[PDB]
């Protein structure tokens, strides 16, 4: 449950065309994700990679 980890700065509200999706990535798959998160879909905001928390 994510009832304590939230921050309103980590989301883009005001739904018009955008939304923040919470994606979880393994630590070994870190470098392959930060090169590919721009091209897993079309029209990705290509700079929004910020690590909220880790395990």
């Amino acid at each position: 449950s994510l009832a304590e980890i939230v921050k309103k700065d980590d989301f883009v509200l005001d739904s018009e065309y955008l939304v923040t999706l919470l994606v979880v990535v393994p630590k070994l798959n870190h470098n392959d994700w930060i090169k590919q998160y721009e091209t897993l879909a079309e029209m990705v905001v290509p700079r929004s990679s910020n690590v909220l928390s880790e395990d």
């Binding site: 065309y17 721009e38 029209m43 990705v44 905001v45 290509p46 700079r47």
Partner: protein, 52 residues
Amino acid sequence: ADVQKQIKHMMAFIEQEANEKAEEIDAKAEEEFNIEKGRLVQTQRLKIMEYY
């Protein structure tokens, strides 16, 4: 360089949607009113001629 390309492609889909969400209601509802003002012309034409 590739990060600035998509954020200007963000501006492209803004301008494309601005074509779609700011011209379509301008097309239909002016044509809807074109029937509506033509309705207003036709509704008086019966009434004013029966006074004649």
